[PDB]
Structures are given as structure tokens and as C-alpha cells.
């Protein structure tokens, strides 16, 4: 399962999806973007590079704990932004990729 989790990350990082996945590669840079309310709204920030480091450090007991951090990442985007924001559309497109792969394991 955890080997299947590494492949899920490889797909989400792949060039085919980079046009909408790139905001989720790294932690939201609140200081550079002026998002000084982000920490008040988002209790648990999460991104793909942090997920990758947690995976390699064996911080996930199983694929469901891995999947929870991926979905936390999307849920943070859906919570913080207005629904018509372009970043929300990008999160949904990347969630499409993740959910189709996660379903196959
Ligand atoms: O949910 C997000 C929201 C935003 C964002 C940026 C500038 C604004 O003026 C704004 O209203 C929202 O930026 C992000 C980002 O840069 C990421 O890498 C990942 C997620 C987000």
C-alpha cells in the first residue's frame, strides 16, 4: 500500500498535471502572498512536498493515513477560498487525478 502511495505522489508531481498541480507542490507561502488570515482559517496546512517527506520518514501507518493528508490539502483549498477562485478549480483537477489512482489500490 505504501509503495502504491509513492506512485500516487509520482503521478501528482508529473509533468502532465503540472499546469494545475503546481500550487500544491510546496507549503502555501503566507508571508509572500499576504495571506495573514490563512493560519486562522486553516488549522493544519498540508502540501505534496510535506506529504512526500512524511511518507519517506514512515509517518503513515497505511494508505488511509496517507490519503487523509492528501485530502486535507484539497479541503484546505476549498475552505479558504471563494468557490469560483481559479485555485479551487486547480485543486479539483488534481483531486480528480488522486481519487482515480487511490481508487485502484
Ligand atoms: O488556497 C490557496 C489560496 C491562495 C491565494 C493566493 C493569493 C490570494 O490573493 C488569495 O486570495 C488566495 O494561494 C495558494 C497558493 O499560492 C498555493 O500554492 C496553494 C493554495 C493556495
Residue numbers in the entry: 353 to 457
Provide the publication's sentences verbatim.
Bromodomain-containing protein 4 (BRD4) binds acetylated lysine residues on the N-terminal tails of histones through two bromodomains (BD1 and BD2) to regulate gene transcription. As other members of the BET family (BRD2, BRD3, and the testis-ovary specific BRDT), BRD4 has two tandem bromodomains (BD1 and BD2) and an extra C-terminal domain (ET) with a high sequence conservation through evolution. Both BRD4-BD1 and BD2 interact with acetylated lysine residues in histone and non-histone proteins to regulate a variety of cellular process including transcription, DNA replication, cell cycle progression and others. Here, we report 3′,4′,7,8-tetrahydroxyflavone (henceforth referred to as 3478), a natural product that exists in the heartwood of Acacia burkittii and Acacia acuminata, as a new inhibitor of BRD4 with a novel chemical scaffold.
Remarkably, 3478 was ∼100-fold selective for BRD4-BD2 (IC50=204 nM) than BRD4-BD1 (IC50=17.9 µM). To better understand the mechanism of different affinity activities of 3478 to BRD4-BD1 and BD2, we performed X-ray structures of 3478 in complex with BRD4-BD1 and BRD4-BD2 which were determined at resolution of 1.30 Å and 1.73 Å, respectively. 3478 binds very similarly to BRD4-BD1 and BRD4-BD2 in the binding pocket. In both structures, the carbonyl group of 3478 forms strong H-bonds with an asparagine residue (BRD4-BD1: N140, BRD4-BD2: N433), and a water molecule near the tyrosine residue (BRD4-BD1: Y97, BRD4-BD2: Y390). 7-hydroxy of 3478 forms a third H-bond with the main chain carbonyl group of a proline residue (BRD4-BD1: P82, BRD4-BD2: P375). These three H-bonds fix the 2,3‐dihydro‐1‐benzopyran‐4‐one ring tightly in the binding pocket. In contrast, its density is well defined in BD2-3478 structure, suggesting a fixed conformation and stronger interactions in BRD4-BD2. 3478 forms one additional H-bond with the water molecule near N433, and likely establishes hydrophobic interaction with His437, as NH of His437 points to two carbon atoms in its phenyl ring. The crystal structures suggest that the selectivity is mainly due to one extra hydrogen bond and the hydrophobic interaction between Histidine 437 of BD2 and phenyl group of 3478.
